[PDB]
Amino acid sequence: ITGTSTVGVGRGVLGDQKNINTTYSTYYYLQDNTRGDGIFTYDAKYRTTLPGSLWADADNQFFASYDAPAVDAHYYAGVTYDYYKNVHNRLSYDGNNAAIRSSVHYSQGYNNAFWNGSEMVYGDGDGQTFIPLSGGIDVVAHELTHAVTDYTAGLIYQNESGAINEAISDIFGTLVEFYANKNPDWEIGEDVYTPGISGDSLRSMSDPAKYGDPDHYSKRYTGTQDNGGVHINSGIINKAAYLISQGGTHYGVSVVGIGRDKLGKIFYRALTQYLTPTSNFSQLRAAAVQSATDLYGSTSQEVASVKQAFDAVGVK
């Protein structure tokens, strides 16, 4: 929409108040002109027709409970845009400042959030398993990270390359959570998952087996459910990323941690320079070793820790 850039105020899903970039033309629209070619948030109105209507508001105030999921989708898209720009010098998901579009209120009682190849889509959850999915910055950054992958490595969403594609999104969603720095951790979706239970989540990176996911290659899932286990087998790579960052001893193999910033640098470089559509786990290991070598040199602690972490999860 053509009009002027303004600043609105509203409340997110978890009741936190925040400023949002809007655009004024008769109404105030959730259209942020300050980042690339814009961030646009739409109302799907409990239907599944996409994108729906660009979110319009009469007074630039977004405090109705109906407003909350749009507030968070809009604001966290902006945090993720800044993470990639300031940390990786990447401008939007295509690297050319493509518009980031998101729809909330998708369908009824929909317990999921996804990138559909063109935009982000969030369900409201059923109030029991999930509250509105855009309330979790790690969920927002997870799904936007799939857009990043699609424009770079283009890892096919099946078997091993698929589990890599899932792991990358868990890794960068966690790193965005740490970057924004509000109660960060190594679990996925804790903020929006089961309002009745403390400390649970969808998945754990520090301990995948907590929720039934393999933490070692010898335990990979080899059936056909979940596109050959893209959500299950991601646990092996998640645990490797956790060990590279934090360090630890895992099945008797010791790893010196190098911190989150270097983990991000190494995996961002592997993603954008070395992985291809069909990459398997062992090729992920080579790409990450070559990444660490370009960045830190072949004799470095960083390279040594990458090899140790992949050793610990059984990936040679």
Binding-site residue positions for Ca(2+) = 57, 59, 61, 138, 177, 183, 185, 187, 190, 193-194, 197, 200
Q: With respect to Ca ion, which residue has the nearer C-beta, 200 or 207?
A: 200
Put residue 107 in one of left, alpha, beta given phi > 0 → left and psi -120 to 50 → alpha.
Answer: left
**What crossing angle do the helices spanning 137-151 and 159-180 adopt, rounded to 10°?**
130
Q: Which of 74, 105, 119, 143 is catalytic?
A: 143
In the bound state, the residue with its beta carbon closest to Ca ion is: 194
Q: Which of 174, 171, 137 is nearest to 269 (CA)?
A: 171
User: Is 143 assigned a catalytic role?
Assistant: yes
Look at residue 223 and give the partner it binds from Ca ion, Zn ion, none, a contact being a CB closer than 5 to 8 Å depending on partner kind.
none
- What are the phi and psi torsion angles at 282 (to 5°)? -65, -40
Let me know: does 14 contact 71? Beta carbons within 8 Å: no
Could you tell me how many residues make up the chain? Answer: 316
Number of residues that bind Ca ion (CB under 5 A): 12
Interacting residue ranges for Zn ion, rule: CB under 5 A: 169
User: Is 302 assigned a catalytic role?
Assistant: no
151 contact partners, CB below 8 Å, separation of at least 6: 93, 94, 95
Q: Which of 105, 216, 231, 250 is catalytic?
A: 231
- What are the phi and psi torsion angles at 303 (to 5°)? -60, -45
What residues form the annotated binding site?
Answer: 57, 59, 61, 138, 142, 146, 166, 177, 183, 185, 187, 190, 193-194, 197, 200
Residues 158-187, interacting with Ca ion (CB under 5 A): 177, 183, 185, 187
Binding region for Ca ion (CB under 5 A)? 57, 59, 61, 138, 177, 183, 185, 187, 193-194, 197, 200
Positions marked active-site: 143, 231
